[model samples]
Target chain A: HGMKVVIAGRPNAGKSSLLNALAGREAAIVTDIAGTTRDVLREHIHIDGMPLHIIDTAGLREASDEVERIGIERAWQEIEQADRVLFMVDGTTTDAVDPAEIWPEFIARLPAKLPITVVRNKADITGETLGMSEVNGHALIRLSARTGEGVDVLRNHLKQSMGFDTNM
Target chain B: HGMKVVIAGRPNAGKSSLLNALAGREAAIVTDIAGTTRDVLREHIHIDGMPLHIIDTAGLREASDEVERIGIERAWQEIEQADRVLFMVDGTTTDAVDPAEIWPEFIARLPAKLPITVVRNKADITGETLGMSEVNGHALIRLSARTGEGVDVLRNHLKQS
Candidate 1:
């Protein structure tokens, strides 16, 4: 099996566009509408001789509505199977809400062994350069999928995170 | 302190667009990117003298990606603090993939007290209507956020759920 890197995030965070940009075509539809990509669309791409299986999933949310519950469930399923997960965040626009106020309860519910990397996407719009960092003890990377800026650094990080170098 | 309603969903699921539709302005910037919402933006709207603090949050994800871990953590944080959580879905689409595989993992992660209501947004895209159903003994709603088709029903459900 090839290396698997799953692109998981909230709706409209540019998972599809990023996939397309990385895949060099419209791999998935790019829309301003949220939850447009309702299922997991997988694609394969080779970067620097490494073949990667990229899985783009539905936006993540709670199952308040019936249809939404299904979508959320599907997203989690994809996450479980992924070798390495890319948590994409829209870097251009910022939210005033605090994560500290919202995550403790949910963290109490997760498995303690899942490894993740935080991807701050759309760095071009935010006027930030693309690259990776260990910010606040979290593996953070800034890149723009639309402009193809900082994608290589992400690819490298994904490879590194999965212990590909060690395996090699 | 108003009644807080966090518009929660997957990336590109139109959470921001729905916020724009409901708030009647471009309160949250609409983009084609996933996880565009880094932080939860709150908009206060009044319906029948009840102030609804509508928060457009970063989309939630279960897998531990670097950027999305922060986002997912943020989403869950909001859900815990929220009076009610609006779990939005794309009504214009259906489960071509079996959602049952992933949903339970996260649902099992949520606190039992957090009141969640599943909503199928974009019903107008399919010219369909919104209704209610029971899934795993939980209430699920189908409605469009774009044309305001089932928003009122969702509002009513929110008021009571």
Candidate 2:
């Protein structure tokens, strides 16, 4: 019944950890193995009395095997149904594989009308470049789920973008 | 590009075993666990010399938790992209839950134009009632993925339908 927000990105990009950080609990499984999350996990959270349904989905990428392919397929389904999509990118690896290169089919399938925020996770390790920026007309937010750096900023940004009370 | 066929249904419905019977090999990881298949597994087999891409996906149902929810979500995605869908049901369990009741959301989301064949798996154990029938204007196929009973009918149906 609340706003549905889906966290999506490549495998092991800290999507599950980010959900844990936001929920302040272990809502989703966190593992080092790529494709550990084969299913979509949902958590209900509130921001200033505004109800939100946050979904942690499988990583998005071209599947190497059948299992991975289905995971990616499920990720796309979440992306399609989301009210907002937080596309997370690993911040520690500056030279990480570009999303365009990793998920060309996924990128092409993203709904044009859906609002997307590119989140560069793990800012504590990535230091100086931790904040908000705009690249090629897309909104970029840098935050760390592990160290809690820039989390408040992300919360504020989410509140502002969704027209929630800034003073709250 | 080959015809993409997805074998989908409720968990432990013999969907994985069905894939093995069709491919005539152990192509999927079969286990007694209800949610043993977490990912989508694919096997390419030739049907009368026609290239066919057979995909075995996670069981479909109302997920009791986060993990199962994700699996069901992925299963829908595979159904969406498939050229045809083999909706497998467990024939051994005569009182099996109705597909409409188990997956109303999935049924609603299914593309109306896509071809769907409802498969009643595990016919060997059920006996007597192991054959073909029609329900609500939909084609129903009964066969055994374990003992290969009526599998040839399924294969022929796959060729004809």
Chain A TM-score for each of the predictions: 0.80, 0.84
Tens digits of per-residue lDDT, candidate 1, B10-93, equal 777778777877777755555566755544556778766677888777687654535445556667777778877667777655
Superposition error at B108 for model 1 (Å): 51
**TM-score: which candidate is best?**
2
True contacts kept of 1: 0.00
lDDT of 2 by residue, A57-147 (tens): 7787666556557666767787999888888888776643344653556556789888777788887777746777765556678889888
lDDT of 1 by residue, A21-123 (tens): 7778664656676765654556777776677888777777654344445556767776777776777778765531122322334323334665556777778
lDDT of 1 at A101: 29
Per-prediction TM-score, please?
Answer: 0.46, 0.51
DockQ of each: 0.02, 0.04
